Design an enzyme around this catalytic site. Structure first.
Site, PDB file in Angstrom:
ATOM      1  N   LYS A   1     -33.641 -59.897   9.506  1.00 16.96           N
ATOM      2  CA  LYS A   1     -32.251 -60.207   9.504  1.00 16.96           C
ATOM      3  C   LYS A   1     -31.415 -60.064  10.816  1.00 16.96           C
ATOM      4  O   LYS A   1     -31.950 -59.168  11.465  1.00 16.96           O
ATOM      5  CB  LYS A   1     -31.697 -59.393   8.488  1.00 16.96           C
ATOM      6  CG  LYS A   1     -32.311 -59.404   6.939  1.00 16.96           C
ATOM      7  CD  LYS A   1     -32.191 -58.318   5.921  1.00 16.96           C
ATOM      8  CE  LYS A   1     -32.731 -58.119   4.654  1.00 16.96           C
ATOM      9  NZ  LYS A   1     -32.429 -57.121   4.076  1.00 16.96           N
TER      10      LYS A   1
ATOM     11  N   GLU B   1     -25.988 -57.155  -0.488  1.00 18.31           N
ATOM     12  CA  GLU B   1     -26.303 -56.467   0.781  1.00 18.31           C
ATOM     13  C   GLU B   1     -25.308 -55.312   1.363  1.00 18.31           C
ATOM     14  O   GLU B   1     -24.095 -55.479   0.890  1.00 18.31           O
ATOM     15  CB  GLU B   1     -26.675 -57.359   1.896  1.00 18.31           C
ATOM     16  CG  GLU B   1     -28.145 -57.765   2.209  1.00 18.31           C
ATOM     17  CD  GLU B   1     -28.878 -56.591   3.075  1.00 18.31           C
ATOM     18  OE1 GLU B   1     -28.062 -55.509   3.254  1.00 18.31           O
ATOM     19  OE2 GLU B   1     -29.811 -56.797   3.670  1.00 18.31           O
ATOM     20  N   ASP B   2     -25.513 -54.511   1.920  1.00 17.95           N
ATOM     21  CA  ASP B   2     -24.528 -53.329   2.675  1.00 17.95           C
ATOM     22  C   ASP B   2     -24.758 -53.270   4.327  1.00 17.95           C
ATOM     23  O   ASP B   2     -24.095 -52.503   4.750  1.00 17.95           O
ATOM     24  CB  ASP B   2     -25.426 -51.926   2.177  1.00 17.95           C
ATOM     25  CG  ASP B   2     -26.359 -51.477   2.987  1.00 17.95           C
ATOM     26  OD1 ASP B   2     -27.162 -52.200   3.322  1.00 17.95           O
ATOM     27  OD2 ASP B   2     -26.480 -50.303   3.309  1.00 17.95           O
TER      28      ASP B   2
ATOM     29  N   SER C   1     -36.120 -57.647   0.646  1.00 18.30           N
ATOM     30  CA  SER C   1     -36.266 -56.535   1.538  1.00 18.30           C
ATOM     31  C   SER C   1     -37.189 -56.759   2.514  1.00 18.30           C
ATOM     32  O   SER C   1     -38.441 -57.418   2.480  1.00 18.30           O
ATOM     33  CB  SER C   1     -36.511 -55.182   0.825  1.00 18.30           C
ATOM     34  OG  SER C   1     -36.919 -53.959   1.911  1.00 18.30           O
ATOM     35  N   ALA C   2     -37.081 -56.447   3.722  1.00 17.54           N
ATOM     36  CA  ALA C   2     -38.089 -56.493   5.090  1.00 17.54           C
ATOM     37  C   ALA C   2     -38.971 -55.366   4.892  1.00 17.54           C
ATOM     38  O   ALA C   2     -39.965 -55.257   5.638  1.00 17.54           O
ATOM     39  CB  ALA C   2     -37.356 -56.556   6.394  1.00 17.54           C
TER      40      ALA C   2
ATOM     41  N   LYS D   1     -31.000 -51.635  11.665  1.00 14.23           N
ATOM     42  CA  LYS D   1     -30.580 -51.830  10.026  1.00 14.23           C
ATOM     43  C   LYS D   1     -31.263 -53.199   9.501  1.00 14.23           C
ATOM     44  O   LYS D   1     -30.930 -54.084  10.026  1.00 14.23           O
ATOM     45  CB  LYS D   1     -29.450 -51.672   9.879  1.00 14.23           C
ATOM     46  CG  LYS D   1     -28.872 -51.514   8.356  1.00 14.23           C
ATOM     47  CD  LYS D   1     -28.793 -50.224   7.763  1.00 14.23           C
ATOM     48  CE  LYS D   1     -27.896 -50.054   6.545  1.00 14.23           C
ATOM     49  NZ  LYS D   1     -28.107 -48.891   5.807  1.00 14.23           N
TER      50      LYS D   1
ATOM     51  N   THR E   1     -32.788 -45.696   1.692  1.00 14.77           N
ATOM     52  CA  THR E   1     -34.100 -45.721   2.513  1.00 14.77           C
ATOM     53  C   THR E   1     -33.858 -45.859   4.023  1.00 14.77           C
ATOM     54  O   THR E   1     -34.448 -45.179   4.632  1.00 14.77           O
ATOM     55  CB  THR E   1     -35.104 -46.904   2.174  1.00 14.77           C
ATOM     56  OG1 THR E   1     -34.249 -48.275   2.616  1.00 14.77           O
ATOM     57  CG2 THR E   1     -35.433 -46.813   0.746  1.00 14.77           C
TER      58      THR E   1
ATOM     59  N   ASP F   1     -31.163 -56.695  -1.919  1.00 16.67           N
ATOM     60  CA  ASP F   1     -31.863 -56.049  -0.515  1.00 16.67           C
ATOM     61  C   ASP F   1     -32.358 -54.598  -1.340  1.00 16.67           C
ATOM     62  O   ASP F   1     -31.589 -54.287  -2.528  1.00 16.67           O
ATOM     63  CB  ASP F   1     -30.992 -55.709   0.375  1.00 16.67           C
ATOM     64  CG  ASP F   1     -31.685 -55.008   1.361  1.00 16.67           C
ATOM     65  OD1 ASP F   1     -33.129 -55.324   1.716  1.00 16.67           O
ATOM     66  OD2 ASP F   1     -31.101 -54.273   2.418  1.00 16.67           O
ATOM     67  N   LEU F   2     -33.198 -53.884  -0.872  1.00 17.29           N
ATOM     68  CA  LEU F   2     -33.580 -52.558  -1.410  1.00 17.29           C
ATOM     69  C   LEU F   2     -32.688 -51.371  -1.048  1.00 17.29           C
ATOM     70  O   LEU F   2     -31.810 -50.967  -1.653  1.00 17.29           O
ATOM     71  CB  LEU F   2     -34.965 -52.096  -1.055  1.00 17.29           C
ATOM     72  CG  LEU F   2     -35.744 -50.978  -1.541  1.00 17.29           C
ATOM     73  CD1 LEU F   2     -35.799 -50.684  -2.953  1.00 17.29           C
ATOM     74  CD2 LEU F   2     -37.213 -50.799  -1.033  1.00 17.29           C
ATOM     75  N   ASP F   3     -32.470 -51.304   0.415  1.00 15.57           N
ATOM     76  CA  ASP F   3     -31.867 -50.425   1.243  1.00 15.57           C
ATOM     77  C   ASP F   3     -30.271 -50.549   1.216  1.00 15.57           C
ATOM     78  O   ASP F   3     -29.624 -51.857   1.166  1.00 15.57           O
ATOM     79  CB  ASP F   3     -31.865 -50.266   2.627  1.00 15.57           C
ATOM     80  CG  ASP F   3     -31.189 -49.436   3.382  1.00 15.57           C
ATOM     81  OD1 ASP F   3     -30.561 -49.802   4.428  1.00 15.57           O
ATOM     82  OD2 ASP F   3     -31.227 -48.253   2.961  1.00 15.57           O
TER      83      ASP F   3
HETATM   84  O1  GL1 Z   1     -41.979 -52.394   6.283  1.00 16.29           O
HETATM   85  P1  GL1 Z   1     -41.296 -50.983   6.379  1.00 16.29           P
HETATM   86  O2  GL1 Z   1     -41.842 -50.166   7.588  1.00 16.29           O
HETATM   87  O3  GL1 Z   1     -41.687 -50.081   4.932  1.00 16.29           O
HETATM   88  O4  GL1 Z   1     -39.655 -51.173   6.577  1.00 16.29           O
HETATM   89  C1  GL1 Z   1     -38.955 -51.990   7.476  1.00 16.29           C
HETATM   90  O5  GL1 Z   1     -37.865 -52.723   6.785  1.00 16.29           O
HETATM   91  C2  GL1 Z   1     -36.917 -51.862   6.229  1.00 16.29           C
HETATM   92  C3  GL1 Z   1     -35.743 -52.544   5.539  1.00 16.29           C
HETATM   93  O6  GL1 Z   1     -35.324 -51.517   4.758  1.00 16.29           O
HETATM   94  C4  GL1 Z   1     -36.313 -50.751   7.496  1.00 16.29           C
HETATM   95  O7  GL1 Z   1     -35.749 -51.842   8.495  1.00 16.29           O
HETATM   96  C5  GL1 Z   1     -37.551 -50.116   8.380  1.00 16.29           C
HETATM   97  O8  GL1 Z   1     -37.026 -49.347   9.282  1.00 16.29           O
HETATM   98  C6  GL1 Z   1     -38.618 -51.353   8.695  1.00 16.29           C
HETATM   99  O9  GL1 Z   1     -39.810 -50.300   9.230  1.00 16.29           O
HETATM  100 MG    MG Z   2     -29.298 -53.368   2.940  1.00 13.38          MG
END
Ligand code: GL1
Ligand code: MG
Length: 219
Positions: free
Chosen positions: A145, A169-170, A114-115, A45, A16, A8-10
């Protein structure tokens, strides 16, 4: 024996979450919603942009049109994109660069789960683009998630089965997503947050190739 590692990135590669929280809190406060605090952010999160906005709107039971929804999501994203312009290789978490190099050396596939639609831009800012074989596209993922979707997509993107992968993951929602994908979860954080049934490290420096190889042999 594992063929891939789904990152995952975060909270694994870099932080992030803090920027995302501040940007979401700022948006919420502009439209009169004052409930987006660190406690409420636990439900936000790791969740996608669209699902995060809907949860914030549901907090104050706010009704919006599809055009208005997209405008609010764009407003927050523009704020977030500004916040991350200065992200550099110095922001990469300890041990991550060495882990990526060691996985590449051992011909083990590397995927991002990552989402965030800003995932590719962030890996570029950190000069990590070359170390990733594939990035799971959140635009092609229908559920955030705790749903397994993003981790299943990350594994399929590198040509492997989730059961042949390790997930890093964290967050609690992210750990559940790895479990439900079929992949083996190794969390970074505390047991009271992430769970008592998974292998957990206190910080990312402990995420070494040899540690991952040992956890996999003990499963
Ligand atoms: O798709 P983004 O807007 O760049 O990022 C999306 O996913 C990330 C996962 O790290 C966070 O949950 C963020 O708040 C959400 O908007
Ligand atoms: Mg994470």
């Amino acid at each position: 024996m594992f063929k891939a590692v789904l990152f995952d990135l975060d909270g694994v590669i870099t932080d992030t979450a803090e920027y995302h929280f501040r940007a979401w809190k700022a948006l919420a406060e502009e439209i009169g919603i004052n409930g987006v605090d660190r406690q409420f952010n636990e439900q936000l999160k790791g969740v996608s942009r669209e699902d995060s906005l809907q949860k914030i709107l549901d907090l104050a039971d706010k009704k919006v049109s599809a055009e208005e929804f997209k405008e609010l999501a764009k407003r927050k994203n523009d704020n977030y994109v500004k916040m991350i312009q200065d992200v550099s290789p110095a922001d990469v978490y300890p041990g991550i660069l060495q882990l990526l190099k060691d996985l590449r050396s051992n011909k083990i596939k590397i995927a991002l789960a990552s989402a965030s639609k800003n995932g590719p831009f962030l890996l570029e800012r950190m000069n990590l683009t070359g170390y990733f074989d594939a990035i799971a596209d959140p635009a092609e993922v229908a559920a955030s998630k705790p749903a397994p979707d993003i981790f299943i997509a990350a594994a399929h993107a590198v040509g492997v089965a989730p059961s042949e992968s390790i997930g890093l993951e964290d967050s609690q929602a992210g750990i559940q997503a790895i479990k439900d994908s079929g992949a083996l979860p190794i969390g970074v954080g505390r047991p009271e947050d992430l769970g008592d049934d998974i292998v957990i490290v206190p910080d990312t420096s402990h995420y070494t190739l040899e540690f991952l190889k040992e956890v996999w042999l003990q499963k």
